[PDB]
RNA sequence: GUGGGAGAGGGUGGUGGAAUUCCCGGAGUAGCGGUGAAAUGCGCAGAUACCGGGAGGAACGCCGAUGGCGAAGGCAGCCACCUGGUCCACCCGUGACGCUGAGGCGCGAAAGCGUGGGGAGCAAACCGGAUUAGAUACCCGGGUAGUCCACGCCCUAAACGAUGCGCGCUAGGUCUCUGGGUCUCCUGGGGGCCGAAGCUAACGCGUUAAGCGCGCCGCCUGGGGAGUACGGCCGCAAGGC
């Protein structure tokens, strides 16, 4: 297992049944692919820099995980399958290098 | 005509999530600034590139903007 | 990929006495393990040559130490092989 | 008959011709002009002069449609890119903003031999 | 061995934006393109320039360097996985286990061959346009193989530092990449520039030798004829040695 940050951005426009729901599905995918959860930072609406799926903005969340480094790739493909997940980026954890620090 | 890391806090260079800081390293045009103006170091620089490009993908920073006046 | 206590369990198994991290046994094993993983990934990813260069060098090193051990104590050499499934 | 009065002016210059386009603020164009439009024919079209008479022609047509205040987008480089600008200046339209949009690829396409 | 690094080293999957082309839609006319100037070409079946949407291939701007990695060929979006090399510190383990390497076996840019895909841009061949002694070569417009991917061949090159690999020794200075230290600096590996001694026909090289030495491999012995012929070997061929 290694430590990762899964990044998910969604289309903002959702009602709460819809948002809670896609978040839940994400949860069950994470749970299913072997991923432990450690932290969650859900930042919500940020105005994007350039349009993504015709939307000026996105609904962000971030998930620190530790999961079998075999399965990261598939857990990514399954995260992405849902239509209303606009972008998904999984990254390995690096420690916090700081300069001019 | 001064340098970036000069006036700026003491900060994560590995942060793809943190725009409020990273924007400061880009041109009016979407461009990443050369060392000559970021005041960085060769390694510092490389990490700044990668963290921008990641950030860019996430829609947090621009791949390009447009030049004003001219 | 080879990790800490994966590697340790091998050093345990082959150390000719407590704490020996360095002997012909330990190297030839540790190495042979390393080869085996490699030739394993190179059974897929046939098309990756640069690693295969690596493995040529790796095997070369093994047969070097091996030849050495064989020269010095034959009993221990047979020993190493009867463990490792080689030559 | 239109009613526009505020909108975009896209100057597009090349080393060969120069072409202006005036357009409603959602970008559906309104009138336009170019080097061959006003008199010129050959090489002549990529002079700065033409760039002027062009930028001008297009403006006096926007006047005809009702135009006044206009935000400019410049695309291209070339002889008299600045001429269409400076023409649009004292054109009688007053220029809200000047932006440079010349698209560059992020390196994708093989260019033809005269270009490498 | 333990602990740390840096990196376009390699393989596989996935994904991002710009641009080009094309398709649909809106607005909108009379040209656009292109050159030294032209013409072919495209355009009233509505082009160009402009906005929105879609399809698809290929390449990755800025960062980028006079930088990094690799044994060489070579390697630049981002992520993940799968791997190779290599540097440093600690001075822990083994105890000469070393160097080179005919033959072998592997790798080997591009172009080229085979069979399948793919095909946006470019583009040998080719089809056209003005230059104007004249293209039919330089310029302009089309354009097929090919460039892209999978598997399999080909094995060449200015494959270049025109400088075989290892090791020991012989002033410094300066810029730099990456480690360690008690961090006006010093110490270890890389990359550059001047330059002791020395070398060199000269040019130049000079702790990244072309200096001083030892080991080992490859190679050389006027020019034309000729990388030809003959013979073998390899190859589907082209052709290679
Ligand atoms: Mg012209
Ligand atoms: Mg280590
Ligand atoms: Mg790489
Ligand atoms: Mg790679
Ligand atoms: Mg249309
Ligand atoms: Mg005509
Ligand atoms: Mg016609
Ligand atoms: Mg027709
Ligand atoms: Mg479009
Ligand atoms: Mg098509
Ligand atoms: Mg550059
Ligand atoms: Mg080269
Ligand atoms: Mg590694
Ligand atoms: Mg000792
Ligand atoms: Mg001893
Ligand atoms: Mg050797
Ligand atoms: Mg021989
Ligand atoms: Mg050989
Ligand atoms: Mg080849
Ligand atoms: Mg090829
Ligand atoms: Mg042929
Ligand atoms: Mg083929
Ligand atoms: Mg084919
Ligand atoms: Mg042509
Ligand atoms: Mg002619
Ligand atoms: Mg063409
Ligand atoms: Mg060279
Ligand atoms: Mg050589
Ligand atoms: Mg030096
Ligand atoms: Mg240092
Ligand atoms: Mg330091
Ligand atoms: Mg040095
Ligand atoms: Mg010198
Ligand atoms: Mg001298
Ligand atoms: Mg001299
Ligand atoms: Mg030497
Ligand atoms: Mg010499
Ligand atoms: Mg002779
Ligand atoms: Mg020949
Ligand atoms: Mg004969
Ligand atoms: Mg023959
Ligand atoms: Mg035959
Ligand atoms: Mg030939």
XYZ file of C-alpha atoms (C1' of nucleotides) and ligand atoms in Angstrom:
658
model
C 0.000 0.000 0.000
C 1.151 3.539 -0.664
C -0.109 6.978 0.334
C -2.020 8.917 -2.306
C -4.163 11.937 -2.847
C -7.178 11.219 -5.011
C -8.536 14.445 -6.575
C -12.085 14.640 -7.715
C -13.835 17.488 -9.496
C -17.496 17.454 -10.240
C -20.060 19.534 -12.043
C -21.370 22.070 -9.451
C -24.957 22.236 -10.623
C -26.149 19.254 -8.588
C -28.908 19.196 -5.964
C -28.045 17.626 -2.621
C -29.582 14.193 -3.340
C -27.378 14.128 -6.423
C -24.219 15.402 -4.712
C -24.523 13.208 -1.640
C -25.186 10.332 -4.093
C -22.136 10.735 -6.332
C -20.038 11.225 -3.198
C -21.405 8.003 -1.743
C -20.640 6.089 -4.975
C -17.124 7.430 -4.849
C -16.893 6.194 -1.273
C -17.982 2.613 -2.280
C -15.515 2.527 -5.137
C -12.652 3.600 -2.816
C -13.814 1.078 -0.194
C -14.074 -1.646 -2.843
C -10.712 -1.186 -4.573
C -8.860 -1.672 -1.281
C -8.217 1.959 -0.434
C -8.008 3.084 3.113
C -9.054 6.665 3.767
C -6.981 8.909 5.965
C -7.963 12.505 5.372
C -10.679 14.349 3.424
C -10.477 17.998 2.237
C -13.552 19.066 0.319
C -13.152 22.599 -0.993
C -16.326 22.770 -3.117
C -16.844 25.567 -5.587
C -13.811 27.151 -7.140
C -14.053 29.166 -10.368
C -11.879 27.219 -12.785
C -9.142 28.785 -14.813
C -10.333 27.527 -18.234
C -13.776 25.954 -19.009
C -14.152 22.254 -18.277
C -17.241 20.569 -19.753
C -18.561 23.960 -20.742
C -18.607 24.930 -17.066
C -16.778 28.011 -15.742
C -16.337 26.158 -12.465
C -15.987 23.008 -10.458
C -16.707 21.238 -7.209
C -13.535 19.940 -5.689
C -12.728 17.296 -3.120
C -9.497 15.585 -2.171
C -8.916 12.296 -0.450
C -5.740 11.085 1.183
C -5.483 7.322 0.895
C -3.303 4.330 1.396
C -4.039 1.599 -1.030
C -2.559 -1.436 -2.817
C -0.291 0.022 -5.404
C -1.473 -2.662 -7.781
C -5.027 -1.329 -7.887
C -4.623 2.435 -8.199
C -4.992 2.257 -11.946
C -8.338 0.430 -11.896
C -9.684 2.476 -9.006
C -8.948 5.440 -11.206
C -10.900 3.985 -14.230
C -13.890 3.337 -11.945
C -13.784 6.765 -10.428
C -13.887 8.292 -13.904
C -16.729 6.152 -15.289
C -19.435 8.320 -13.656
C -20.597 10.989 -16.076
C -20.782 13.799 -13.622
C -17.203 13.399 -12.370
C -15.501 15.974 -14.498
C -11.919 15.208 -13.630
C -10.037 12.760 -11.516
C -6.346 12.884 -10.685
C -4.696 10.367 -8.409
C -1.198 11.242 -7.173
C 1.303 9.510 -4.907
C 2.022 11.389 -1.690
C 5.256 13.341 -1.564
C 6.316 15.100 1.648
C 6.116 18.842 1.708
C 9.231 20.327 0.097
C 9.298 24.122 0.771
C 11.681 26.646 -0.590
C 12.214 30.220 0.411
C 10.993 28.464 3.503
C 11.670 44.699 -11.948
C 12.218 42.391 -8.822
C 11.904 38.668 -8.119
C 9.058 36.384 -7.056
C 10.278 34.130 -4.247
C 11.755 37.333 -2.824
C 8.346 38.749 -1.838
C 6.257 35.725 -1.025
C 5.794 33.676 2.152
C 7.511 30.480 3.185
C 5.685 27.937 1.097
C 4.990 24.571 -0.359
C 6.525 24.082 -3.758
C 4.855 20.653 -4.036
C 1.360 22.031 -3.800
C -0.821 21.460 -6.831
C -3.861 22.435 -4.891
C -2.721 25.851 -3.875
C -3.422 28.453 -6.461
C -3.268 31.625 -4.422
C 0.477 31.056 -4.380
C 1.136 29.471 -7.783
C -0.579 32.058 -9.901
C 2.281 34.303 -8.850
C 4.721 32.309 -10.975
C 2.945 32.740 -14.350
C 2.913 35.438 -17.085
C -0.120 37.516 -18.026
C -0.086 34.967 -20.863
C -0.449 31.493 -19.377
C 3.345 31.042 -19.361
C 5.525 29.796 -16.489
C 8.121 32.377 -15.708
C 11.850 31.823 -16.480
C 14.221 31.600 -13.546
C 15.528 35.094 -14.370
C 12.302 36.339 -12.945
C 11.203 33.609 -10.458
C 14.393 33.865 -8.492
C 14.455 30.103 -8.121
C 17.011 27.340 -8.149
C 17.449 24.647 -10.735
C 15.734 22.061 -8.534
C 13.339 24.617 -7.084
C 12.488 25.410 -10.677
C 11.809 21.872 -11.818
C 9.440 21.258 -8.949
C 7.613 24.471 -9.714
C 7.086 23.372 -13.320
C 5.635 20.030 -12.376
C 3.378 21.483 -9.701
C 2.073 24.068 -12.105
C 1.354 21.487 -14.863
C -0.524 19.292 -12.413
C -2.370 22.311 -11.172
C -3.190 23.212 -14.754
C -4.756 19.857 -15.453
C -7.032 20.247 -12.391
C -8.387 23.489 -13.875
C -6.833 25.587 -11.196
C -4.415 27.483 -13.396
C -4.639 28.481 -17.104
C -2.866 26.867 -20.007
C -3.085 30.270 -21.596
C -4.513 33.765 -21.144
C -4.456 36.777 -23.387
C -2.144 39.781 -23.659
C -3.686 43.142 -22.733
C -2.742 46.518 -24.279
C -0.247 45.892 -27.177
C 9.476 -4.213 -6.166
C 12.091 -5.569 -3.684
C 11.474 -4.050 -0.243
C 13.037 -3.807 3.147
C 11.833 -6.883 5.019
C 11.434 -8.823 1.814
C 15.145 -8.365 1.462
C 15.803 -8.988 5.095
C 14.074 -12.403 5.015
C 16.620 -13.345 2.372
C 19.577 -11.990 4.270
C 18.372 -14.043 7.309
C 18.063 -17.204 5.294
C 21.514 -16.913 3.779
C 23.751 -15.244 6.328
C 26.655 -17.558 7.034
C 26.454 -16.276 10.619
C 24.608 -13.549 12.557
C 24.776 -10.016 11.106
C 26.595 -10.930 7.909
C 25.234 -8.658 5.282
C 28.117 -9.136 2.936
C 29.257 -12.652 2.079
C 29.344 -14.576 -1.165
C 26.198 -16.481 -0.033
C 24.237 -13.333 0.820
C 25.233 -11.570 -2.406
C 24.554 -14.488 -4.694
C 21.221 -15.068 -3.161
C 20.114 -11.510 -2.852
C 21.162 -10.984 -6.439
C 19.554 -14.201 -7.684
C 16.295 -13.084 -6.076
C 16.681 -9.722 -7.854
C 17.314 -11.408 -11.238
C 14.325 -13.610 -10.817
C 11.956 -10.687 -10.234
C 13.519 -8.973 -13.201
C 13.383 -11.788 -15.740
C 9.870 -12.065 -14.522
C 8.906 -8.510 -15.566
C 10.890 -9.022 -18.748
C 8.673 -12.014 -19.621
C 6.011 -9.369 -20.173
C 7.321 -6.046 -21.411
C 9.410 -8.033 -23.826
C 9.876 -4.774 -25.705
C 11.795 -3.120 -22.858
C 15.414 -3.625 -23.679
C 17.279 -1.258 -21.382
C 16.222 -3.262 -18.311
C 17.264 -6.451 -20.078
C 20.782 -4.945 -20.401
C 20.624 -4.587 -16.677
C 19.861 -8.223 -16.327
C 22.671 -9.360 -18.457
C 24.989 -7.480 -16.094
C 23.213 -8.934 -13.084
C 23.558 -12.469 -14.197
C 27.134 -11.819 -15.148
C 27.837 -10.689 -11.554
C 26.129 -13.735 -10.157
C 28.164 -16.188 -12.226
C 31.257 -14.260 -11.191
C 30.724 -14.726 -7.517
C 29.489 -18.084 -8.164
C 32.647 -19.081 -9.992
C 34.550 -17.665 -7.068
C 32.720 -19.576 -4.383
C 33.077 -22.707 -6.504
C 36.804 -22.112 -6.545
C 37.083 -21.671 -2.790
C 34.734 -23.939 -0.974
C 32.990 -26.410 -3.333
C 30.932 -27.786 -0.515
C 29.389 -24.348 0.132
C 28.950 -23.837 -3.574
C 26.951 -26.998 -4.061
C 25.156 -25.707 -0.957
C 24.208 -22.387 -2.561
C 22.921 -24.138 -5.640
C 20.990 -26.884 -3.860
C 19.223 -23.956 -2.133
C 18.701 -21.610 -5.029
C 17.800 -23.881 -7.988
C 20.637 -22.646 -10.343
C 23.341 -23.912 -12.759
C -31.100 47.754 -39.909
C -29.474 46.297 -36.743
C -28.901 48.210 -33.520
C -25.521 47.132 -32.211
C -23.440 50.094 -30.897
C -20.884 48.257 -28.671
C -18.771 45.275 -29.816
C -15.658 43.407 -30.968
C -13.184 44.349 -33.730
C -10.961 41.487 -34.783
C -7.978 42.521 -36.676
C -6.280 39.568 -38.384
C -2.890 40.287 -40.054
C -0.574 38.075 -42.108
C 2.374 38.859 -44.313
C 0.133 38.784 -47.323
C -3.138 40.367 -46.438
C -4.831 42.075 -43.515
C -8.452 41.637 -42.624
C -10.815 43.293 -40.130
C -14.060 42.011 -38.786
C -16.579 43.861 -36.646
C -18.963 41.808 -34.598
C -21.655 41.782 -31.926
C -20.451 41.305 -28.396
C -21.425 37.629 -28.540
C -19.214 37.352 -31.642
C -21.563 36.980 -34.593
C -19.947 39.255 -37.111
C -21.483 42.302 -38.540
C -19.342 43.612 -41.336
C -15.845 43.145 -42.465
C -13.158 44.433 -44.737
C -9.806 43.432 -46.120
C -7.019 44.389 -48.467
C -8.675 43.193 -51.643
C -11.947 44.581 -50.427
C -10.775 48.137 -50.695
C -8.903 48.479 -53.936
C -5.660 46.544 -53.796
C -4.792 43.315 -55.537
C -1.391 41.757 -55.292
C 1.440 41.920 -52.887
C -0.068 45.391 -52.471
C -2.636 44.026 -49.947
C -0.116 43.402 -47.200
C 1.036 46.975 -46.929
C 0.228 48.933 -43.796
C -1.693 51.441 -46.028
C -4.208 48.797 -46.979
C -4.358 47.733 -43.358
C -5.455 51.266 -42.699
C -7.996 51.725 -45.478
C -9.380 48.381 -44.396
C -9.668 49.016 -40.730
C -11.275 52.306 -41.761
C -13.733 50.804 -44.212
C -14.900 48.242 -41.711
C -15.373 50.970 -39.080
C -17.420 53.317 -41.358
C -19.611 50.236 -42.019
C -20.027 49.670 -38.268
C -21.024 53.338 -38.050
C -23.607 52.585 -40.703
C -24.930 49.752 -38.365
C -24.853 52.107 -35.388
C -21.550 51.146 -33.791
C -19.603 53.301 -31.276
C -17.510 51.701 -28.503
C -15.351 48.736 -29.541
C -12.984 46.087 -27.972
C -10.253 44.932 -30.274
C -8.780 41.468 -30.704
C -5.549 41.208 -32.632
C -4.542 37.964 -34.320
C -1.401 37.609 -36.344
C 1.750 39.553 -36.949
C 2.605 41.457 -40.026
C 3.139 44.664 -41.869
C 0.541 46.989 -40.454
C -0.989 44.958 -37.719
C -0.376 48.185 -35.865
C -1.824 50.056 -38.778
C -5.177 48.577 -38.435
C -4.868 49.330 -34.800
C -3.877 53.020 -35.270
C -6.573 53.315 -37.960
C -9.227 51.956 -35.659
C -7.917 54.442 -33.164
C -8.865 57.757 -34.668
C -11.403 55.787 -36.718
C -14.121 57.660 -34.891
C -14.952 54.538 -33.023
C -13.547 54.742 -29.538
C -11.641 51.688 -28.500
C -12.524 50.089 -25.241
C -9.706 47.454 -25.059
C -6.800 46.003 -27.073
C -5.992 42.359 -26.723
C -3.524 40.128 -28.442
C -4.963 36.657 -29.252
C -2.585 35.253 -31.921
C -3.025 31.495 -31.490
C 0.168 29.479 -31.207
C 0.041 25.769 -30.984
C 1.491 24.043 -27.886
C 3.539 22.327 -30.530
C 1.466 19.988 -32.628
C 1.540 20.074 -36.358
C 4.250 19.638 -38.842
C 4.658 22.958 -40.556
C 5.495 23.137 -44.228
C 9.060 23.357 -45.402
C 9.236 27.164 -45.857
C 8.398 27.320 -42.182
C 11.127 25.182 -40.600
C 24.598 -3.859 3.804
C 22.019 0.392 5.950
C 20.436 5.327 5.112
C 19.700 9.011 1.844
C 19.293 11.631 -3.257
C 18.791 13.728 -8.832
C 17.264 12.564 -13.551
C 13.070 13.782 -20.982
C 17.062 5.906 -18.986
C 13.210 1.777 -20.417
C 8.064 -0.848 -20.792
C 2.721 -0.854 -20.182
C -1.952 1.270 -19.483
C -4.649 6.420 -18.718
C -5.371 11.313 -19.449
C -4.812 17.430 -20.663
C -4.688 21.749 -23.199
C -3.127 24.791 -27.669
C -3.008 24.297 -32.832
C -4.075 22.204 -37.995
C -7.728 19.537 -40.942
C -12.703 18.062 -41.618
C -18.085 17.752 -40.353
C -22.759 20.323 -38.235
C -24.872 25.270 -36.690
C -25.193 30.759 -36.373
C -24.093 35.376 -38.055
C -21.815 37.533 -42.604
C -20.041 39.206 -48.033
C -16.396 39.205 -52.435
C -12.898 37.686 -52.374
C -9.309 34.497 -50.186
C -4.624 32.385 -50.758
C 0.035 33.114 -52.416
C 4.774 35.608 -54.580
C 10.439 39.256 -55.948
C 5.894 40.074 -58.774
C 2.603 36.510 -60.430
C -0.421 32.477 -61.822
C -2.384 27.740 -60.974
C -5.797 26.817 -56.805
C -10.233 27.732 -53.754
C -14.741 31.130 -53.594
C -22.329 33.159 -55.094
C -23.716 25.216 -54.295
C -21.610 31.455 -49.761
C -15.495 30.747 -49.178
C -12.079 33.867 -46.135
C -12.132 36.477 -41.072
C -15.928 35.520 -36.458
C -18.783 32.672 -32.820
C -20.647 27.859 -30.778
C -20.680 22.340 -31.152
C -18.632 17.683 -33.011
C -14.916 13.985 -35.288
C -10.053 12.371 -35.729
C -4.861 11.876 -36.002
C -0.177 13.625 -34.691
C 2.999 16.355 -31.828
C 3.947 18.273 -26.733
C 4.537 25.866 -26.123
C 6.153 28.424 -21.518
C 9.348 25.782 -17.784
C 14.196 24.771 -21.305
C 19.514 26.150 -20.148
C 25.528 27.304 -22.835
C 20.536 21.671 -18.006
C 19.616 16.226 -17.005
C 19.618 10.718 -17.980
C 21.541 6.552 -21.063
C 26.528 1.770 -22.948
C 25.416 3.483 -27.728
C 21.316 4.502 -31.150
C 18.760 7.879 -28.513
C 15.216 10.142 -24.497
C 10.847 16.331 -23.232
C 2.590 17.223 -21.538
C 0.650 15.135 -16.912
C -0.599 10.633 -13.703
C -0.191 5.650 -12.254
C 2.055 1.086 -12.330
C 6.451 -2.184 -13.918
C 11.919 -1.753 -14.264
C 17.393 -0.508 -15.396
C 21.658 2.305 -14.317
C 24.113 5.692 -11.042
C 25.950 9.391 -6.946
C 26.735 10.366 -1.779
C 27.208 9.458 3.697
C 28.068 5.785 7.634
C 33.356 2.308 7.456
C 28.956 -2.318 8.950
C 29.774 -7.464 5.838
C 32.748 -10.685 2.222
C 38.052 -11.069 1.442
C 41.340 -10.256 -4.691
C 35.972 -12.367 -5.787
C 39.981 -8.033 -10.378
C 40.731 -5.517 -15.808
C 40.190 -6.507 -21.094
C 37.783 -9.311 -24.118
C 38.998 -12.745 -30.618
C 34.186 -15.694 -31.493
C 29.481 -15.740 -29.792
C 24.648 -13.498 -28.278
C 21.921 -8.728 -27.628
C 20.915 -3.534 -28.724
C 21.182 -0.404 -32.911
C 18.830 6.952 -35.844
C 16.667 7.373 -40.372
C 15.196 5.392 -44.684
C 13.614 0.537 -46.666
C 10.697 -4.879 -46.787
C 6.291 -8.220 -44.932
C 1.452 -8.715 -42.894
C -2.315 -6.232 -40.551
C -4.452 -1.478 -38.812
C -4.477 3.972 -38.912
C -4.089 8.454 -41.889
C -5.105 15.207 -39.234
C -0.264 18.057 -40.863
C 3.731 17.279 -43.820
C 5.338 14.883 -48.027
C 9.905 11.410 -52.251
C 7.311 9.897 -56.849
C 3.895 12.312 -59.421
C 0.008 16.419 -61.644
C -0.299 21.369 -62.396
C 1.221 27.529 -61.915
C 4.524 32.231 -63.107
C 10.588 32.504 -63.249
C 11.302 33.885 -68.192
C 17.928 31.350 -72.536
C 15.105 27.284 -69.684
C 12.653 23.332 -65.816
C 11.154 19.586 -66.749
C 15.898 21.879 -60.260
C 15.396 26.329 -56.533
C 9.468 29.753 -55.845
C 3.666 28.619 -55.776
C -0.762 25.225 -55.854
C -2.417 19.809 -55.459
C -0.557 14.966 -54.136
C 0.557 8.984 -53.323
C 3.972 5.834 -50.708
C 5.838 7.130 -46.284
C 5.976 9.593 -41.618
C 1.881 7.073 -36.738
C 0.567 1.949 -33.999
C 1.090 -3.956 -33.471
C 4.100 -8.211 -34.744
C 8.264 -9.673 -37.813
C 12.715 -8.531 -40.944
C 16.754 -4.931 -42.515
C 22.114 -3.680 -39.310
C 23.675 0.961 -42.342
C 25.445 6.681 -40.966
C 29.478 12.771 -40.251
C 26.365 5.805 -35.324
C 31.069 12.175 -34.161
C 34.384 14.209 -28.974
C 35.971 12.105 -36.565
C 39.357 10.891 -29.620
C 38.219 1.825 -27.529
C 37.449 0.174 -22.138
C 40.108 0.061 -16.818
C 43.520 2.010 -13.423
C 47.566 5.040 -11.058
C 50.280 9.715 -11.311
C 51.162 15.141 -12.721
C 49.528 23.604 -11.005
C 45.490 26.401 -10.662
C 41.435 29.592 -12.129
C 36.132 30.177 -13.448
C 30.708 29.095 -14.642
C 27.613 25.023 -13.514
C 24.263 20.101 -12.273
C 23.629 16.815 -8.091
C 25.084 14.761 -2.975
C 27.555 15.129 2.228
C 29.859 18.696 5.959
C 30.944 21.822 11.415
C 27.921 25.633 4.785
C 34.113 33.243 4.222
C 34.327 27.654 2.243
C 35.623 22.443 2.133
C 34.741 17.275 0.354
C 32.557 13.473 -3.617
C 30.498 12.533 -8.445
C 28.651 14.896 -13.676
C 28.811 19.002 -17.516
C 31.597 23.453 -19.704
C 35.539 27.459 -20.361
C 40.677 29.403 -19.741
C 45.288 27.639 -18.514
C 51.214 24.742 -14.992
C 54.131 20.933 -16.562
C 54.204 18.173 -20.570
C 52.584 16.966 -25.457
C 51.754 18.206 -30.646
C 53.427 18.905 -37.893
C 50.685 22.813 -36.847
C 45.776 23.542 -35.165
C 45.395 22.462 -30.702
C 45.010 18.953 -25.896
C 46.127 20.010 -20.987
C 42.975 15.941 -13.481
C 36.330 15.274 -18.786
C 44.903 14.712 -21.836
C 45.750 14.497 -27.231
C 50.692 14.661 -20.589
C 53.449 10.584 -17.687
C 52.766 5.137 -17.227
C 50.815 -0.388 -17.271
C 47.027 -4.076 -19.025
C 43.844 -5.871 -22.739
C 40.899 -5.524 -27.489
C 40.089 -3.137 -32.633
C 42.598 -0.990 -36.597
C 46.643 1.320 -40.137
C 50.850 0.674 -43.858
C 50.838 6.182 -51.192
C 46.764 7.831 -55.119
C 43.550 6.242 -59.180
C 41.421 1.378 -60.295
C 37.619 0.186 -55.827
C 34.344 -0.557 -51.311
C 34.779 -2.489 -57.779
C 35.366 -7.915 -59.161
C 35.471 -12.970 -57.702
C 34.118 -16.271 -53.597
C 31.584 -17.133 -49.221
C 28.125 -15.823 -45.409
C 23.600 -13.137 -43.988
C 18.687 -11.104 -46.166
C 11.642 -11.893 -48.576
C 13.904 -7.935 -51.197
C 16.661 -3.457 -51.175
C 21.263 -4.742 -49.863
C 24.667 -5.716 -45.991
C 29.554 -7.890 -43.901
Mg -1.166 39.178 -50.862
Mg 20.722 2.256 -0.893
Mg 11.586 9.372 -18.335
Mg 8.684 6.608 -19.777
Mg -20.008 27.935 -41.575
Mg -10.617 36.070 -59.805
Mg -14.565 28.482 -60.675
Mg -17.297 24.515 -58.904
Mg -14.371 25.535 -34.512
Mg -11.421 10.955 -40.851
Mg 13.624 27.142 -25.613
Mg 24.114 12.378 -31.030
Mg 15.369 3.488 -9.522
Mg 35.958 -3.373 7.540
Mg 37.947 -10.206 8.261
Mg 33.755 -6.245 -20.304
Mg 38.545 -9.914 -35.210
Mg 31.963 -8.927 -29.338
Mg 17.426 0.217 -37.625
Mg 11.799 3.821 -39.183
Mg 9.605 0.061 -52.622
Mg 5.212 -1.198 -43.274
Mg 0.491 -0.405 -44.404
Mg 5.321 20.852 -52.932
Mg 8.588 27.165 -66.331
Mg -0.362 20.864 -49.263
Mg 29.249 15.624 -33.429
Mg 33.069 5.483 -30.538
Mg 37.272 22.351 -13.837
Mg 28.817 20.869 -3.995
Mg 24.583 21.655 0.805
Mg 34.313 19.260 -11.419
Mg 42.491 24.650 -23.149
Mg 53.845 25.159 -22.874
Mg 48.728 27.897 -30.196
Mg 43.643 9.145 -18.768
Mg 47.635 12.545 -29.963
Mg 47.924 0.756 -55.572
Mg 28.600 -1.031 -49.858
Mg 38.488 -14.645 -55.583
Mg 29.062 -11.237 -53.703
Mg 19.671 -16.760 -50.852
Mg 23.250 1.071 -50.831
